[PDB]
A paper describes a structure:
The ATPase domain of pP1192R (1-434) was expressed in E. coli BL21(DE3). The crystal structures of the ATPase domain complexed with AMPPNP and ADP yielded high resolutions of 2.3 Å and 2.6 Å, respectively. The AMPPNP in the structure of ATPase domain partially acts as an inhibitor of pP1192R but lacks specificity.
One intriguing example is the [name], which stands as the sole mammalian-infecting virus encoding a type II topoisomerase. The ORF P1192R encodes a functional Topo II (pP1192R) which is highly conserved across diverse ASFV isolates. Prior extensive structural and biochemical studies have elucidated key aspects of Topo II catalytic mechanisms. These structures have unveiled the inherent architecture of Topo II, which is characterized by two principal heart-shaped functional domains: the ATPase domain, responsible for ATP hydrolysis to fuel the molecular machinery, and the central domain, which interacts with the DNA duplex and contains a catalytic tyrosine residue that cleaves the DNA duplex.
Numbering used by the authors:
A (entry chain A), B (entry chain A): 3 to 405
Write the structure that this text describes.
Amino acid sequence: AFEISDFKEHAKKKSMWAGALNKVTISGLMGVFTEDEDLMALPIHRDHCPALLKIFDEIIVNATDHERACHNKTKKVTYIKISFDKGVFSCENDGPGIPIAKHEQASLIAKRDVYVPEVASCHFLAGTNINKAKDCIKGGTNGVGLKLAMVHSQWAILTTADGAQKYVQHINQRLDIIEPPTITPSREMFTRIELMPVYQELGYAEPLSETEQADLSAWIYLRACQCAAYVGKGTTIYYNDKPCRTGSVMALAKMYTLLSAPNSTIHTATIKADAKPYSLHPLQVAAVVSPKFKKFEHVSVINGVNCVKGEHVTFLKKTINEMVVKKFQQTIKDKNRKTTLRDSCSNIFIVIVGSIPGIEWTGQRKDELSIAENVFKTHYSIPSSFLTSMTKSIVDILLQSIS
Amino acid sequence: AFEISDFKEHAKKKSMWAGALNKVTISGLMGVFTEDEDLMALPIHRDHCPALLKIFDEIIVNATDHERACHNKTKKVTYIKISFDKGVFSCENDGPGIPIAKHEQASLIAKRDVYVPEVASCHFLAGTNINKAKDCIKGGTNGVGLKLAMVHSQWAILTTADGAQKYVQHINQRLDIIEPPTITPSREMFTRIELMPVYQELGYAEPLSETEQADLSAWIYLRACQCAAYVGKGTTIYYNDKPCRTGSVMALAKMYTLLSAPNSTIHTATIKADAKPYSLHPLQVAAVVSPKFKKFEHVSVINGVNCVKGEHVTFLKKTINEMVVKKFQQTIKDKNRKTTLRDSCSNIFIVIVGSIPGIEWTGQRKDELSIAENVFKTHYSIPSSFLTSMTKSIVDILLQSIS
Ligand SMILES: Nc1ncnc2c1ncn2[C@@H]1O[C@H](COP(=O)(O)OP(=O)(O)NP(=O)(O)O)[C@@H](O)[C@H]1O
Ligand SMILES: Nc1ncnc2c1ncn2[C@@H]1O[C@H](COP(=O)(O)OP(=O)(O)NP(=O)(O)O)[C@@H](O)[C@H]1O
Ligand SMILES: [Mg+2]
Ligand SMILES: [Mg+2]
């Protein structure tokens, strides 16, 4: 039988939008746990629901998108408050709110009065990034993420104020009940999404178990730390009302390596480009090099997205490898052995944070960015001091393994 | 400005559907090249357009989906003819055709007469897999792939016959011109998609250059070889009218390793499960182990999809590693050295082909399958002879590297 579906039912049934709709093994799943005034990034060796993490992610990247959008403007985003308590998830930013105004074409379609936040939250393929510029470094592009959050919410509340009015709209039952909004005068300016996911439909206990709750809190806490490193310097990231410590890639590196390699040496670099638009967006990099690292490992926040695959990583890997091979054959008086990238890089843990204009993704989840490798070969340069430091640490480890 | 988009314009502008819409560096890009009656899988070190390869892939996986759907039936798919010539791309299968019948709800929506092939090819989120069963091993799930092919076609022709009628419909200008279909009597039974992509819009020369043409032909030829290993035994896969040789994972392994390691030993296993539905779908595996392999490498055809990431790989990796560590500490009289998965597996090239029921993906592209790791720990077993052979080859290589 041949069936025609709408966005709503499709997004509830299909994994192409946010990942699997039940618990699966997520490789590299991490969370932040507090051990006596110390943040540690630890693995979560338990299956979780990718789509569940995506609905947090979509709203968080919407907030960091607003922050970049306003950072060179008069009214800026000074904070991103994220909270997670008793299952309820909330995110609030303070730049200009979403325009409290009637959407003409959306109302013509709906045959009733529809305002912009209702389009932004309930209309698939809708937003301000349908026509993205080549220089735009927002993560958002599809006009889909927010509605993915709504469709996986038992209940949700969009609140937004623009300095003259406040606008409150309830969106319930997986986008099936869209209450008419309530518009009052207010002089506040902010955007807040507040929602309860459908934890049971997504494979979780109702309410969340002790372990599920702790795992999800740790994961969200981690995402907030990542924002705090990516976001600009006038913006505080809060999670459950505490500010997020990690405003630098060095802080992120220390967090991820607190256990494998405490008290270790952090190689740092700011990778710059010479031609606009790339020269507008330096990449911050911190790397630790340890013999007790078993494989190569990276953490990337690119355009606010915690993506796990992309040619920026390969750019750093290949550059470091070429230098490592040169100095290994120099330092070794054996002069015959041939090492490759796995030997070069398996003792490296690296953090890369920043914006890259003009990238594309392999799906809505934005797990993998898509780019020509030559973008980096043409435009970017890794500072030689960082390369030298790194090569030195790595060749030390190689020579001692063959010692 | 807040914009509302339709499927058509969205799919032309957005990379979430099929990948990047221009040329990017695709890691692991391979193609099949003929060298004097020998097929070799060689890297393509040139940027290509992921969405362009996806429109070939979508139709090819639709065909292998039909093949699985009909394999236990009376009228089977006996062939999948694929061709690529002068830019035109074509794919034809011979099971029962697409129902030549009026679609009621689609006609009610369109306010005119719409037949099932027009829904199948022009209506997003539409198909026979909107409600997939947990045991279904077709790649198709979203009701999207075929329309992605149409939207990236300057012109296309859907032809399908059901044994009493033939149905010809033209779909042109990136799904903007949908000509009314032409229905005649015929006693043939088949489905054919024939189309010209928008190579210029996707970053290519018009017409294709010598290198682009050769790269794309090699890549499609490779995909067909993969089908020929995945498809059932009554089904011939043709590419440009020649049959595709590689009906076994051993043939695939030899093709991929013809240069790095000719005349090499191929470890083979059929990984079975004991509980339905998994016991209905054995995984075929072929692996080569060579000192001149620089990193771990796999080729996977799962449910007809050439996916590149999934916990099936990790299942094999971890099992082989546990055995390799045991026998390494046994064979070594050093008895202290500790090796991990990278040491265990960096000399392995492995092919895994077959069906897995109940999997999910991370996006439409289906680059990565999503599953609980325990599915394999509970249900599947790797034959011990294969594990033993593999461990032996690997420990030989490790002992000679430390020799
Ligand atoms: N916190 C926010 N502050 C301001 N505007 C917002 C905020 N969240 C969402 N928006 C607006 O709502 C629109 C719709 O959001 P969304 O559905 O996530 O699409 P998107 O972020 O543009 N692209 P994508 O996330 O890739 O689907 C966005 O384009 C923004 O214009
Ligand atoms: N070669 C074919 N033979 C028979 N039926 C086909 C063939 N190609 C397509 N169809 C039918 O057309 C429908 C629509 O195709 P498609 O748009 O690719 O969706 P899908 O394959 O079901 N799921 P997806 O590919 O993940 O978007 C399919 O569900 C099939 O029922
Ligand atoms: Mg968004
Ligand atoms: Mg399909």
